Swiss-Prot record, chain A:
Summary of the knockout phenotype: Abolishes recruitment of the mediator complex to the upstream activating sequence (UAS) of amino-acid starvation responsive genes. Decreases RNA level of genes involved in amino acid biosynthesis and cofactor biosynthesis during amino acid starvation or methyl methanesulfonate stress. Growth dependent on amino acid supplementation. Sensitive to amino acid starvation. Sensitive to purine starvation. Decreases cellular glycogen levels during glucose starvation.
Residues in bZIP domain copies: 4-74
Domain note: Residues 89 to 100 and 106 to 125 define the N-terminal activation domain (NTAD) and the central acidic activation domain (CAAD) respectively, which can function independently to promote high-level transcription of the target genes.
PTMs per UniProt: Phosphorylated by the cyclin-CDK PCL5-PHO85.
Family affiliation: Belongs to the bZIP family. GCN4 subfamily.
Protein name: General control transcription factor GCN4
Subunit-level organization: Homodimer. Each subunit binds overlapping and non-identical half-sites that flank the central CG base-pair in the pseudo-palindromic motif 5'-ATGA[CG]TCAT-3'. Interacts with the mediator tail; the interaction with GAL11/MED15 is direct. Interacts with the SAGA histone acetyltransferase complex. Interacts with the SWI/SNF chromatin remodeling complex.
Lineage: Eukaryota, Fungi, Dikarya, Ascomycota, Saccharomycotina
Protein's organism: Saccharomyces cerevisiae (strain ATCC 204508 / S288c)
Compartments, as annotated in UniProt: Nucleus
Reported induction: Translation is induced by amino acid or purine starvation, or during growth in low or poor carbon sources. Translational repression during nutrient-rich conditions is dependent on four uORFs (upstream open reading frames) present in the 5'-UTR of the mRNA; these promote ribosome dissociation. Translational induction occurs in conditions reducing translation machinery efficiency, leading to ribosomes scanning over the uORFs, and increased translation of the mRNA. The rapid translational induction is followed by transcriptional induction at later time-points, independently of the uORF sequences.
Residues of the whole record sequence present: 250 to 278 of 281
Gene that specifies this protein: GCN4
Region described as Leucine-zipper: 7-70
Known function: Master transcriptional regulator that mediates the response to amino acid starvation. Binds variations of the DNA sequence 5'-ATGA[CG]TCAT-3' in canonical nucleosome-depleted 5'-positioned promoters, and also within coding sequences and 3' non-coding regions. During nutrient starvation (low or poor amino acid, carbon or purine sources), it activates genes required for amino acid biosynthesis and transport, autophagy, cofactor biosynthesis and transport, mitochondrial transport, and additional downstream transcription factors.
Length: 74, 73, 72
């Protein structure tokens, strides 16, 4: 029966390797989700810097107009 | 009978493998999707770094007009 | 019978070996996405320092201007 035994052995080994593959996959999916979550945080930070910049540019616009006033008076 | 049961097991294994192969195919797509989103970011940063350059130069010039005014009054 | 079974087993083993290699690649691709993602909070922090510097420069400029207007 050693031919059949060898077969049943190889089968067990295959089932065992599958189990481990299914588990590596479940990990991989969480890693991807971990990377997905970080990626999503970025835009809000960029957006916030962008509002800050617009507000600086506004304040500089006004400053330039105050200076223009002062020049014309002196 | 011993053989029949080996044959069913082989059938199930091939089936589990078929599913695995579809899950991997899907995982790749999602890793390529994350490369796509990650990759927009650098250009965004550069656009900001350019506005900051503009701004630092406006300020320098402002500081210099102010210095000239202070000498005139 | 046995010869068919043996041949299918060999196919399955080489399918599994291929899957294990694809998994190994995928893990490297994920780790490299990770790295790129982690370089971002640094870039954002440096910008934020520049912005702080600029807002402090503006505050001071507004002060200079307010004092000029008092004199004239
Ligand atoms: Br990823």
């Amino acid at each position: 029966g050693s031919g059949m035994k060898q077969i049943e052995m190889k089968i067990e080994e295959i089932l065992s390797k599958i189990y481990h593959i299914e588990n590596e996959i479940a990990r991989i999916k969480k890693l991807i989700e971990a990377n997905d979550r970080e990626i999503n945080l970025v835009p809000a930070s960029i957006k916030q810097i962008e509002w800050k910049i617009e507000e600086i540019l506004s304040k500089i616009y006004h400053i330039e107009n105050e200076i223009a006033r002062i020049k014309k008076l002196i």
